[PDB]
Model the fold of this input.
Amino acid sequence: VSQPIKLLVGLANPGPEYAKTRNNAGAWVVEELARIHNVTLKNEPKFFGLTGRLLINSQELRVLIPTTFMNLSGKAIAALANFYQIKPEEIMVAHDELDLPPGVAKFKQGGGHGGHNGLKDTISKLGNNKEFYRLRLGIGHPGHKDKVAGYVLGKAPAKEQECLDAAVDESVRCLEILMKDGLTKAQNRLHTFKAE
Done:
């Protein structure tokens, strides 16, 4: 009956070269949610990104995919949140997560960036507030700390992308349930999912 999320953001590097790289996982969630719910995203330069508004259980969800550099994602998030008066606590940020494997996704309230550039800037531009929700989509991590950025800015191989594509799908279904049954039941379901 009741839930705190008014803005779902899917983080991304801009353009066709990046559309299918791992660092765009967040956007994949927002893109798919929006296709399912028939909304076409509008490029609004004042919000440095692609935005839209959805009705899910007669509840209003705004969605955003920044067109900024990943590390300036906070410009878009803040400009939009502040225009519509959305507090951080009411924002969910969907984003690639190194500390989880492909095929897994998790909700979380709060925490750090884990060296994710988008999250850092989002914390920062939200006036150093980390209390926004996150949708952590596992992308695995590479062998070495130094290989991370290439991994993250690279395309997953086919087999691994199916696990990612299924975590995306389930994340979306659990966002639909979030709006209908709340955070707890949405979470209960998502956290039993491991892509087969």
About this structure: The longest helix spans residues 158-181. The CA atoms of residues 103 and 162 lie 8 Å apart. The first strand starts at residue 7 and ends at 10.
